[PDB]
Amino acid sequence: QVDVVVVGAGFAGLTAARAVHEAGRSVLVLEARDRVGGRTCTEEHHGTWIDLGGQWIGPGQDRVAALAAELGVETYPQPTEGDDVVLFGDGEPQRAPDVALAFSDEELTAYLELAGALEAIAEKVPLDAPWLAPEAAAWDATTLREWVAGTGVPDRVAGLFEVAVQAVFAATSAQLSLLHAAHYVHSAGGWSKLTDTEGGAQQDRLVGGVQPLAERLAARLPDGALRLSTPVRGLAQDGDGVTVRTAGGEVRARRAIVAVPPTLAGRIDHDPPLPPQRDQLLQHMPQGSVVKFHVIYDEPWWRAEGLSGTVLCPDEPIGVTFDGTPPAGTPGIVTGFFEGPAAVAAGARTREERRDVVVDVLARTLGERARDVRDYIDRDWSAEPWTRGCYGAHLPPGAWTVYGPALRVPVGRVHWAGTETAERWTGYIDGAIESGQRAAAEVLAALG
Amino acid sequence: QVDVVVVGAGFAGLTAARAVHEAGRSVLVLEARDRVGGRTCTEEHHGTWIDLGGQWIGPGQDRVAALAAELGVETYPQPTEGDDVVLFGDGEPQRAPDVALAFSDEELTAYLELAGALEAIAEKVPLDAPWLAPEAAAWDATTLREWVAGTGVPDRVAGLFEVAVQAVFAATSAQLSLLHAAHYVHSAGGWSKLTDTEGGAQQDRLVGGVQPLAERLAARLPDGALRLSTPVRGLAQDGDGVTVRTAGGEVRARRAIVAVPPTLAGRIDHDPPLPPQRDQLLQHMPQGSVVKFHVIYDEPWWRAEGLSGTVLCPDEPIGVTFDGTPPAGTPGIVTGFFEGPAAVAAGARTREERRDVVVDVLARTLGERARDVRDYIDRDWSAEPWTRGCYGAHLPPGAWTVYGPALRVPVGRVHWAGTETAERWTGYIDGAIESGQRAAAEVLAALG
Numbered sequence A, B: 001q002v003d004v005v006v007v008g009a010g011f012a013g014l015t016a017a018r019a020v021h022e023a024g025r026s027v028l029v030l031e032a033r034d035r036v037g038g039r040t041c042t043e044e045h046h047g048t049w050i051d052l053g054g055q056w057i058g059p060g061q062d063r064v065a066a067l068a069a070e071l072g073v074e075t076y077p078q079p080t081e082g083d084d085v086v087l088f089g090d091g092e093p094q095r096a097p098d099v100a101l102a103f104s105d106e107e108l109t110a111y112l113e114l115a116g117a118l119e120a121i122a123e124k125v126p127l128d129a130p131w132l133a134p135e136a137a138a139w140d141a142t143t144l145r146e147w148v149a150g151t152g153v154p155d156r157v158a159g160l161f162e163v164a165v166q167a168v169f170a171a172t173s174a175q176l177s178l179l180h181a182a183h184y185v186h187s188a189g190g191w192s193k194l195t196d197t198e199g200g201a202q203q204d205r206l207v208g209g210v211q212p213l214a215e216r217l218a219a220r221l222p223d224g225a226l227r228l229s230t231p232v233r234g235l236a237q238d239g240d241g242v243t244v245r246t247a248g249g250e251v252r253a254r255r256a257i258v259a260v261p262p263t264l265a266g267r268i269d270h271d272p273p274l275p276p277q278r279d280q281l282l283q284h285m286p287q288g289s290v291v292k293f294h295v296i297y298d299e300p301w302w303r304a305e306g307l308s309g310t311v312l313c314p315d316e317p318i319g320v321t322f323d324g325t326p327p328a329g330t331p332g333i334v335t336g337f338f339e340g341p342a343a344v345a346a347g348a349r350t351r352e353e354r355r356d357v358v359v360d361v362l363a364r365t366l367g368e369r370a371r372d373v374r375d376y377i378d379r380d381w382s383a384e385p386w387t388r389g390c391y392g393a394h395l396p397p398g399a400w401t402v403y404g405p406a407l408r409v410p411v412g413r414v415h416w417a418g419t420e421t422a423e424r425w426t427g428y429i430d431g432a433i434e435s436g437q438r439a440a441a442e443v444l445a446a447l448g
């Protein structure tokens, strides 16, 4: 019998396990995959790191910044220089030093006042209990899309906002409750924190990619504490402890931290069954839909033409791109995402068909040199059996107020972690770490 | 190796198994519970049958009516006589021959216009492909609640409509896409079909209850075909067949029919993993929330006072009640439901606490004789590990159009049944039977 069994070796589970270990308690981490890092995943291709999962940290994210520095991982800045390209429907691509300046002054004002109005709502949503917002009943019964329509903003402003919503939530404004969206914005500290490079969540990358930072965190655990390729199938509990069932046998512990995406937490064979409010909360916490890609070129040819590599296309299957070129300056990489419906359509197609769609959008925005592609590497996180969608869960209307209060509440000896349980930077690596710190503190207090 | 393995001995699984068997193919039915019937469940108490799950059949439910006839189960009518009682907030209870006649003629007109307008939308929704409705994109981007507000119907009319929505869907109008609600209404053949007793889904009951009809259907299988208390944990397939994993070992078949609620279908360990569109569809098909109760009296005392035993209290935790007394005329039974948010709140309390809430509402509406209770029997279907909510799944905005197309499509040698896959009377016993007939036909075509 160990003191704590942790299910999942994402940043949440590894953070929880290292905190239990450093407090001097015994811990076992059971991870389904043959690797740590979960929704962060780094592969070596073309002599550089390819982050197929989470890759960016920003200066409001104190826990991931501290962990990167603690474990000796260097950061590099997300390229900021060069013109952005904006494309609307059947129109001509517009170059501009910033995407802001491809709109009228009235449009930019309306966009910024829209963002300001969502932040006004967001500030009133308690980070620990969104269901206790004074207008929780109204806001949880409204989609974000209905709220956008009530502002009366023009089409091109609603369209620009929709690109940003899909890039942040991996879901459309019609899928999200306003209460969910507003909580998420509060959790990040504002709309510009979610959307911006400089000053925001996309400011910095890790030299060598993000999975190696998870490997360094796992290296703080003693030999034998981490079991890879060991999916948790069952979690039974009684008055004395918890019994974990794997294909390979049984693990006994005093307490458990389950640190997996909500959909996957509900699929475990719990004995006794989870209480109905928490089972149905997980039924109401669907993962997002994103396909992340890296288009590889021999060089970042767009830089020589004064382009940043960022395109913004509210009408295309790809909404937003970034220059993903490493500090060495080769190979050239354009990084981007299919989001929401576009992700589900693209996920049903082949890699070559997704490549063709991306290259076609880049050809019409960056230029026809985009068709001379060296390689194209992508990942549909919906098709990952141990994730079942990035970046994280969202809550549709009605879910936060009725089922939401069960989110973090322990069920006897089974405690909960995962970015979806964080108060600050929920949905990000930074919130995954927060959740592991919180769950570890709970379990250590409960052991006696 | 049997020709077909069926997962689940609900009406859908049992119907599929009997159709495969009658075509001369070998079949095994693996059922998790110690009984058949699934979301139908009958217990003997006070010398009568208590239907804890599905209980009613009505006109236009041709498949369940034919099955009842075939297997020798007689119907008895849902009592229709006596005054209904309507109560708003802290007002006086209103007696009326019908719920209709507790409202002004302007209110009734507005209600019937609202019902008519939803039926018009419904008739445009293809029963086999709701996502191919010409306005599918707009209808799936709206909640039913937003649509109700857009009609401009008065608030007290929207409030009465909301009671009906929660009674039918076991969910609020804010949880449902308009496209989902429209499809469901088309599937039933109209609003009146869903809400009415005489002429609608609540018209008739089965003598002896519904589980015995499932037991008679299961008795048409050869000895040894049905295995009870055998939860399916895994379902593997290759080019040659399927392998079912249970606690006890492995069952091989050529093809599988999975006939369980969507949430439970996603928790099976599929090898290969389900395609991402179907996995994420199940994440977007949460079960409703209902606690169904029967209050038992020595006699149906309300009949002698000219009361039907139906109360309608939009501002109380319980929805519509019904005279649940059997044809013998004793014991007296009041049947009713906690629905949606009220069901989630009620599920977290004890049976005795739910009893006290029900009895206080009945005392206020039927009178003080409602406190003279013999017994109180209820079931929280959210707490049932092999259902995880009644009556069935609903779909939030964005789900039908983006993920919905994966609903019925076989995945290699694995076919899908369950009421949630029915075209006609989806959500009812009648649709469960349809889905079983359809899945059997697909598997028989594939074997031959």
Ligand SMILES: *Cc1cc2c(cc1C)nc1c(=O)[nH]c(=O)nc-1n2C[C@H](O)[C@H](O)[C@H](O)COP(=O)(O)OP(=O)(O)OC[C@H]1O[C@@H](n2cnc3c(N)ncnc32)[C@H](O)[C@@H]1O
Pocket: A007, A008, A009, A010, A011, A012, A013, A030, A031, A032, A033, A035, A036, A037, A038, A039, A040, A052, A053, A054, A055, A056, A057, A230, A231, A232, A233, A259, A260, A261, A264, A268, A290, A291, A292, A381, A386, A387, A389, A390, A391, A392, A417, A418, A419, A420, A427, A428, A429, A430, A432
């Ligand atoms: C997928 C993704 C995520 C992402 C992103 C882009 C994509 C495509 N961009 C990000 C970014 O640039 N910066 C950032 O901060 N976040 C970004 N995100 C999100 C981020 O990756 C996640 O928020 C974070 O990684 C989540 O961490 P958490 O520890 O909460 O969850 P996890 O990584 O999913 O780990 C769970 C582990 O559990 C294992 N598992 C699942 N089921 C089981 C069972 N039954 N038994 C045992 N183990 C299980 C998983 O394999 C995983 O390792």
Ligand SMILES: *Cc1cc2c(cc1C)nc1c(=O)[nH]c(=O)nc-1n2C[C@H](O)[C@H](O)[C@H](O)COP(=O)(O)OP(=O)(O)OC[C@H]1O[C@@H](n2cnc3c(N)ncnc32)[C@H](O)[C@@H]1O
Pocket: B007, B008, B009, B010, B011, B012, B013, B030, B031, B032, B033, B036, B037, B038, B039, B040, B052, B053, B054, B055, B056, B057, B230, B231, B232, B233, B259, B260, B261, B264, B268, B290, B292, B381, B386, B387, B389, B390, B391, B392, B417, B418, B419, B420, B427, B428, B429, B430, B432
């Ligand atoms: C719960 C309920 C349902 C209901 C209703 C009232 C309540 C409280 N009132 C109804 C009514 O008056 N008239 C009517 O026509 N329907 C009513 N409903 C709905 C109705 O009961 C359902 O639509 C229908 O019974 C569903 O049948 P179906 O065959 O599709 O589904 P099921 O009954 O849930 O059966 C599934 C079986 O699968 C077993 N199970 C689940 N998981 C597993 C695994 N992993 N392995 C093996 N077996 C599994 C279940 O135990 C179940 O028996």
Ligand SMILES: CCCCCCCN
Pocket: A164, A167, A168, A194, A195, A196, A202, A320, A391
């Ligand atoms: C416009 C910014 C999009 C950010 C996508 C990554 C979220 N982790």
Ligand SMILES: CCCCCCCN
Pocket: B164, B167, B168, B194, B195, B196, B202, B320, B391
């Ligand atoms: C208004 C009717 C209430 C009963 C619904 C039962 C659904 N099968």
Ligand SMILES: [Mg+2]
Pocket: B079, B080, B081, B082, B097, B308
């Ligand atoms: Mg009547």
